[PDB]
Design a protein around this motif. Structure first.
Motif, short mmCIF file in Angstrom:
data_model
loop_
_atom_site.label_atom_id
_atom_site.label_comp_id
_atom_site.label_asym_id
_atom_site.label_seq_id
_atom_site.Cartn_x
_atom_site.Cartn_y
_atom_site.Cartn_z
N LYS A 1 31.58 -10.73 -23.46
CA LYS A 1 32.07 -11.04 -24.79
C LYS A 1 30.96 -11.60 -25.67
CE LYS A 1 34.95 -14.42 -25.19
NZ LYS A 1 36.20 -15.20 -25.00
N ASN A 2 30.09 -12.43 -25.09
CA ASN A 2 29.00 -13.00 -25.88
C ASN A 2 27.96 -11.96 -26.25
OD1 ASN A 2 26.03 -14.48 -25.52
ND2 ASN A 2 27.46 -15.52 -26.89
N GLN A 3 27.77 -10.95 -25.39
CA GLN A 3 26.73 -9.95 -25.64
C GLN A 3 26.97 -9.19 -26.94
OE1 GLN A 3 26.17 -7.36 -22.27
NE2 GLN A 3 23.94 -7.63 -22.31
N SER A 4 28.23 -9.05 -27.35
CA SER A 4 28.52 -8.35 -28.60
C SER A 4 27.94 -9.09 -29.80
CB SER A 4 30.03 -8.16 -28.76
OG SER A 4 30.64 -9.38 -29.13
N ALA A 5 28.27 -10.38 -29.93
CA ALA A 5 27.71 -11.18 -31.00
C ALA A 5 26.19 -11.28 -30.89
CB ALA A 5 28.33 -12.58 -31.00
N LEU A 6 25.67 -11.33 -29.66
CA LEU A 6 24.22 -11.33 -29.48
C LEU A 6 23.60 -10.09 -30.11
CD1 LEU A 6 22.58 -12.69 -26.29
CD2 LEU A 6 21.62 -10.62 -27.28
N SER A 7 24.09 -8.91 -29.73
CA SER A 7 23.56 -7.66 -30.25
C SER A 7 23.72 -7.58 -31.76
CB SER A 7 24.25 -6.47 -29.58
OG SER A 7 25.64 -6.70 -29.48
N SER A 8 24.85 -8.08 -32.28
CA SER A 8 25.05 -8.07 -33.73
C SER A 8 24.00 -8.92 -34.43
CB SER A 8 26.45 -8.57 -34.06
OG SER A 8 26.48 -9.99 -34.16
N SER A 9 23.71 -10.11 -33.89
CA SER A 9 22.70 -10.97 -34.48
C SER A 9 21.33 -10.31 -34.47
CB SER A 9 22.66 -12.31 -33.74
OG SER A 9 22.69 -12.11 -32.34
N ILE A 10 20.93 -9.77 -33.32
CA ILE A 10 19.62 -9.10 -33.25
C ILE A 10 19.56 -7.90 -34.19
CG2 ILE A 10 18.17 -7.68 -31.75
CD1 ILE A 10 19.89 -10.81 -30.39
#
Lengths: 49, 48, 49
Positions: A19-28
């Protein structure tokens, strides 16, 4: 609670990481190309405007 | 000549700004890409 | 993490950098040159007029 077939703690932590990886990828991605929208999939109103 | 100038002219004021924007975006992309390569490294720690 | 064979979070960044490179090249070559059209890659109407 001494079972070994199912490790519920691993499942919980893995889904948390997923779940956190989605927001991570969005930020990058937003850092990558200069856009908060960048062909937004969350809202279409801002894109149309 | 004055009329032709409008069609093709450098317009340095906007061009330097666009170049600076592109350079900043390129540097930011390179930084976040170098930061992106370390994501699959945690699996090694997961193994042992 | 969950996948190793594919890393899309880097592919999106590569695509963004590639898209930025076009604008960078255009701006830099138009800055070095005195013109704005730069061999009619833009709208050919301006070049013809």
């Amino acid at each position: 609670a001494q079972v070994i077939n199912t490790n519920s703690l691993s499942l919980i932590t893995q889904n948390n990481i997923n779940k956190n990886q989605s927001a991570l990828s969005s930020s990058i991605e937003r850092l990558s190309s200069g856009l908060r929208i960048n062909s937004a999939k969350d809202d279409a109103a801002g894109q149309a405007i | 000549s004055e009329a032709q100038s409008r069609i093709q002219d450098a317009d340095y004021a906007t061009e330097v700004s666009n170049m600076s924007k592109a350079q900043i975006i390129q540097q930011a992309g390179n930084s976040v890409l170098a930061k992106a390569n370390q994501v699959p490294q945690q699996v090694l720690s997961l193994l042992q």
